[PDB]
Amino acid sequence: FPNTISIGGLFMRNTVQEHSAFRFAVQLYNTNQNTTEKPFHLNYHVDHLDSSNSFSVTNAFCSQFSRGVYAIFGFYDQMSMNTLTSFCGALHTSFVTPSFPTDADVQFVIQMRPALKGAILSLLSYYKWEKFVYLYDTERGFSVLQAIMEAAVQNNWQVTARSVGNIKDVQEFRRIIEEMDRRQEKRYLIDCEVERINTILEQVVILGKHSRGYHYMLANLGFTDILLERVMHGGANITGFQIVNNENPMVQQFIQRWVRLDEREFPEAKNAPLKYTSALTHDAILVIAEAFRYLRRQRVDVSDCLANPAVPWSQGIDIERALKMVQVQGMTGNIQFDTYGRRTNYTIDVYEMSRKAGYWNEYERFVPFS
């Protein structure tokens, strides 16, 4: 079994903190005082993608594939997802990612981010939301959008859906809200990126008269990066979701070390709050280390991109299977995967604003406190 295991890193625009968390988590793997948990040296090479254009992406992936990495950590967006997942599946190279989980059932993709739709549907049912507005963009896929479409037909809900992903004019959010007032709409599910949630919420405040009596359910695991003090002042209910529990001592002890790190060597660790995607990045390194320690224990053997007679990687299958079978405790709770690399047996914490109102998991569904 090798002395060194090398992994790839594919990073996008605006993943600076995650890059830092990645470098730091690897360093924690390598400086562990316990020799049993560190039987090989963990090493890496990183590429940054200026864009998600298909050529740029393929070039980057193949340069790393050619170096001989044993797995690849990285990010995709709506534009690059299909290229990365397709090359990984064809070349048997496991891609570990904290990006949004895919719609399709693919091989060789470990999705660190749990799905939200189960929790969202449970809370729609628990709050009895049978008439509501659903503002969405497509940047985290279509998974939630379709679950909501299907449930609306099946339950006879009046959902007014509006696709806000392309709006560059903040005045146009106002025109949408004013329209929804004419229909008496007080309940809003907002399935957007964080920055767009903040934009939308600023318009709610500035426009005015849109707090007391209203309820915004924010379907995004980046709850703690959402600026929502101005909306709460008016009296609005807000429901949110998190997967990082701050009272968890593992998170606490990680944070303690994290905030001491130098601004040059590890940017966005002092000056910025910990994003949930940097927590998933930390947990990706736990999962990768655990899988390779497992392979060493099983005594499994491990060792050109655009070949026309493309030769499959023999050992890739064991690496995939090893990553999928890990059970580890991380900053995002219990971490396990099903056969399509999706998180299973996870917990989503539900926040009502500022108490934790309950938790959701796959078996119990939504359990409220009190």
Ligand X SMILES: *[C@@H]1O[C@H](CO)[C@@H](O)[C@H](O)[C@H]1NC(C)=O
Interface ranges with ligand X (CB under 6 A) = 34, 36-37, 186-187, 213-215, 237, 334, 336, 345
- Residue with Cβ nearer ligand X (141 or 330): 330
Among 32, 43, 53, 246, binds a second copy (CB under 8 A): 53
Q: Nearest-CB residue to ligand X? A: 334
Q: Using CB under 8 A, which of the segments 59-67, 95-103, 118-126, 249-257 binds a second copy?
A: 59-67
SS3 of residue 331 by DSSP: coil
* Cα gap 85→369, rounded to integer Å: 40
* Cα gap 119→362, rounded to integer Å: 9
Among 39, 89, 234, 267, binds a second copy (CB under 8 A): 89
Structure tokens of 368? 């409220």
- Residue with Cβ nearer a second copy (45 or 233): 45
Using CB under 8 A as the binding criterion, the count of chain residues that bind a second copy stands at 21
Q: What are phi and psi of 130, to 5 degrees?
A: -110, -10
- Residue with Cβ nearer a second copy (170 or 306): 306
| Dihedral angle computed from the Cα positions of residues 50, 55, 57 and 59, in that order, rounded to the nearest 10 degrees | -100
C-beta separation of 342 from 115 below 8 A: yes
CB of 35 to ligand X, least distance (A): 8
CB of 133 to ligand X, least distance (A): 11
Instruction: Choose among 184, 198, 206: nearest CA to 238.
Output: 198
- Report the partner that residue 310 touches, choosing among ligand X, a second copy, none (CB closer than 5 to 8 A by kind): a second copy
Which residue is it, tokens 């393929």? 58
Q: What are phi and psi of 52, to 5 degrees?
A: -110, 5
C-beta separation of 341 from 326 below 8 A: no
Kindly state whether residue 143 participates in binding a second copy, applying the rule CB under 8 A: no
- Residue with Cβ nearer ligand X (186 or 296): 186
Q: Using CB under 8 A, which of the segments 217-225, 291-299, 303-311, 337-345 binds a second copy?
A: 303-311
Among 6, 27, 86, 125, binds a second copy (CB under 8 A): 86
SS3 of residue 368 by DSSP: strand
